[PDB]
Design a protein around this nucleic acid. Sequence first.
RNA 1: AAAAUUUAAAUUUUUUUUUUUUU
Lengths: 223, 215, 74, 293, 339, 222
Amino acid sequence: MSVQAEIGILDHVDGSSEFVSQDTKVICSVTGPIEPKARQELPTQLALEIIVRPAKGVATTREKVLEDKLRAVLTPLITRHCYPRQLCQITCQILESGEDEAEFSLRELSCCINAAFLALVDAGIALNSMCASIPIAIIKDTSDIIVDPTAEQLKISLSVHTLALEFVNGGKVVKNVLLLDSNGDFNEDQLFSLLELGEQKCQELVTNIRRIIQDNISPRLVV
Amino acid sequence: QDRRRLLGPAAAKPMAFSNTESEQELSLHTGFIENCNGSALVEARSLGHQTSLISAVYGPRSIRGSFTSQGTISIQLKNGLLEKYNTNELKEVSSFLMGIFNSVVNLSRYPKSGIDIFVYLTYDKDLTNSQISSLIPHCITSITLALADAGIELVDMAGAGEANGTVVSFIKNGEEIVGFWKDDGDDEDLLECLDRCKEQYNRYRDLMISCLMNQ
Amino acid sequence: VPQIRDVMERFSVLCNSNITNSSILLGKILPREEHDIAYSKDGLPNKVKTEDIRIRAQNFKSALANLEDIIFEI
Amino acid sequence: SEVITITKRNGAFQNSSDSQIVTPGELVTDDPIWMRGHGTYFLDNMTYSSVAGTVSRVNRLLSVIPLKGRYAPETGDHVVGRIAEVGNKRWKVDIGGKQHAVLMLGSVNLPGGILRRKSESDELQMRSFLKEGDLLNAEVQSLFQDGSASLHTRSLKYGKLRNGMFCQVPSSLIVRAKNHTHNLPGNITVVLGVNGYIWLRKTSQMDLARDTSSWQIYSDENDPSISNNIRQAICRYANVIKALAFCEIGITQQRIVSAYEASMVYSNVGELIEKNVMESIGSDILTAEKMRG
Amino acid sequence: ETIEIHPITFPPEVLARISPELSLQRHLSLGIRPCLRKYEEFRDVAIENNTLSRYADAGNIDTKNNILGSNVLKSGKTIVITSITGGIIEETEDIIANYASVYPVVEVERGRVGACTDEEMTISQKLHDSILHSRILPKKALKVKAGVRSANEDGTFSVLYPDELKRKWSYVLYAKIVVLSRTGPVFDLCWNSLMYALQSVKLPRAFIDERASDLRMTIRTRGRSATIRETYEIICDQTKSVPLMINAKNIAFASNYGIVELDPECQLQNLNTVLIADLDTEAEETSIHSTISILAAPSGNYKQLTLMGGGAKITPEMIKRSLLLSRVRADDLSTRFNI
Amino acid sequence: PEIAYPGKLICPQYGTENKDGEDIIFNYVPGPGTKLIQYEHNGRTLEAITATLVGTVRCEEEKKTDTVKNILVSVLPGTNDFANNLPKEGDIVLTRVTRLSLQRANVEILAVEDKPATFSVSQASSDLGETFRGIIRSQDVRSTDRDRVKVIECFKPGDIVRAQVLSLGDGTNYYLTTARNDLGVVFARAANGAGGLMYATDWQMMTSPVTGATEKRKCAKP
RNA sequence: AAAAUUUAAAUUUUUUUUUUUUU
């Protein structure tokens, strides 16, 4: 599990986190709740605006959808009624690819969720549950399934997959699925098998994470 | 280039090719867009030339600007698929559009209220082996039907008729003119340019009122 | 009276002086009435009867406005 | 017998009483005894002008009056406002100066007068009595901390205009006197604003009342009885205003009368627009200024 | 205190404008949809293909038109028209690098003037993505085999075409989606309307000159020099054309799904967790939060699947149910218009 | 004169019957859907009542009590429209609360009722910010205790209010009131959508059944 | 020798991507 993270590493920003998995370095930033614009408010719930900068090039359409699916996942994570007529701008930076951006977007989508989850903990906003995302691929030639592949394995991968889950009761109960990003060729039969490791693995991920949060923040906490 | 769209790799290019009194006709339809409150559909086909276009209504929309006594019209001409008329070529027509309806619409019935008009020059055949001037009068007809569909207070079924690069718009069964447009043509052909426009106007308005009163 | 009658005279003649579609290209699909379909346990296409949903709507209007009159509650 | 003045000049972009005239950045003096007012800034002695203008030394007060600038609003002045906006119970209205004047809700003559007292429903009818761009007679009350001032209509004599036509001038040529409403043969009346705004209209009975119904103080109506002999006589007084404005002439009420009778050479009223002839009549009056007084 | 609190009820058209959500909950009480449908009643789909391409008339292809294979789509209350053009760049098993796509541009005429809306900017990306993930298109299908126009005797031209095999060239295709009367989610109809346009695309016969006049030119450096390569402008034929080669066994179709959970309060007599597909009707699109969208080619194949779970849980069985409902709705449309 | 296209010329300004030997004059009075249009034909002028819309002719009359005859001309649709029923002064309009100021309250216009219930909802999409919005000022909520006004104790965002038009105001928004014992709050969900449905306890108070929770809203008389 | 006399300053949101200028 060659993952590792940092909390509270920016200065003027409410929530900040560096998430580092095996090859990709991504930092996310959270500022909120702050003053919303005119065209942006909601009378009841909390308004969210999300920016992802790539490592390379500028913000285009390829960025836009990875943003927007990430809009969908955070919306139930946030206790959105708690902050009416408000705004939390959240911003993600891709620093390292770790995957061919021309051909793939898979790991980053797993990465940025795992990034933005922790900067909210830095931010300390009313949230709902716990979460995790992993990238999963199925090899074209071997026809086997690897959790957390590499980009060369992505080249021989047949189908690329991202699973986002909602974890409660010690992060143990799968409360709901958040995202299942099925891409590539697949059938019925692989899919329930495709969950069935990530059923375990994301909890196994969070099992690491629960420790990490308290280790970083209980010395920031006072006794 | 444009960082907001997918325009392909730059060094590509589109594909290239080289050489190796008549009747106009309509098919007019309303009530088919659920975003709008006024829709109108127009087919046209005449002798080498087949044309289809869509007129869209949004109103009365609120005005964030300030107070007005009455209503305000906004008109958009947009290229469809094949034919590409020039940008500045478009808005000149949009200017010519608004003048006529400002002798049509009871804006005084609609204080502080907006009028949105979207015209989609969707598809045109010109198979013939002032190219925008041949499509002027059909716009006014296409707008009028959609504006009847939103049910807005209109004085007259006003229409324009065409005679060979010349566009003249009428009311009162042709007994007054509300909109004048002229390109090159002859000199002092105006009196015949009264006539052939008028009778198409005499044709068209009857085709329009059939499209609604029979529905 | 004859002045208004003169108007009623003159309203005659001027009002007397004033007094089929084929959709070639696209209009045979644009005001196409929409339909809905269904599949049975076979999965074979079952087009919706138009008459049912009107009765559904009249069922929908009925149990709405009548059963929402008095709500007897704790 | 023409249509247009087309005179040609090709090959060029352009054709090309003593007092202190000072510049910005310039020292006046460093006598400390002087006081430092408008157009003046300083460093403890160094008296420094800030505009193109004149040194004014008033008895110990030194100050710089400029030559160029917008209209300066002062209290008690008789000017003309064009309605800019409507506020909460406020209105905005152009002076022509730096900023708008303000105008309180109850600052105006009510139809029926004071027997009509206050009402909160009146702010539901601000647009009833007034709306945008309209012209009126206004009385300059007092100011704010900056130099922006306000208005009111404390008379029947002040109120919303009708029965004529507007024109406008630079504020400089309008001379100050103890009177501003003036009545001219031709049964008509000039309403010279101070600020540079000029309204003509037909002489009313209230105008006639100055020298010997009330529900019509927000009307857009005129007297329906307006002859062309009224209307064409308006235009003759209209152009001679711009004649003096083009000729840089201080307005005397009599000079206008002198402008009018000198304009009786020309019955073709459309010929009152000529650069030379306005200057000619402009040259007439200045020569005629060298006889009387 | 036990109180008969009389509520206030309205016409239904009042209610949906007010509550998108409770008016939905009225329909769920009877178990219907506010688009007047029952749970699984699905919209009709109607097309015409190839009407707006110049290759409509096989007999007389006209002159100034530039459209390859066209598609009309109406389903429900939203008409969408798909148009295909193509361009050419001078070109110099089942793995992704064999696989290309097109360049689409969507517009939704949703009344708003202004710049490119953010809903649109997702769309042309999202299609292109799973088109790559469909693996439909080997670039062998883009390989262009040009002819040379032999300047023959007495001033006549015949294009020598080679057959069955120095530079190479490649088609690059384009799309445009216009969206009229948006009533709900659009992506499935964005998908499916393209698919029928894809099958109607002819590849026009491209050829180069026999020996083009546009030849090599030199450019002087500050003492040195180089040579511009000869500019062989490819020309497509006014007449001849070939069709398009497709991995036809991967042509998917689209379907969305929604799962909701129910209030006891909202019933009107004439847990509980209901699957709805064929989603529309703003109130639905507001209030459904756990959703499923699927691509599938009719033999049990799947180009993609899309889960956003934000409302209910997801059972393993609503999955299989939607899968059962997937292979129906797609396969009918494969067989519906038989293109 | 029964069914009308816009531009259908209908009747002159005046008409004549003879009801029993004494002469009776008609006065055709222009209403909605109408316009008097002068018409010169072969020399002589003529004013006429003009159909300006789509649907049906309807001629009516009523004299104000509190041989000529006035006849109101009235033009309608006939066998979905709201520009027909744009809000005028004094109307009763159902609105949804947008934002709560200490100054005031802001809503958007959604639905207009009618006289002798009959309604006209707007068919617009608020998610464009399209619709007409209005403003309730906080002292205009009611007249009883109109000074020390506590705004939060009557309204929350997103809620439904039977409110009366004060006037036009600006072009941007409206002058609006609720200042009656029959007017005010119609319906909302608990905790602004975060909970169930709430019922007006009195005319002056509101609770919720399943919860056991109440809130202060200036509810309408039911 | 008393008596008293004067003021008043203004509040809550509408817009279109970056080349490319003579060793």
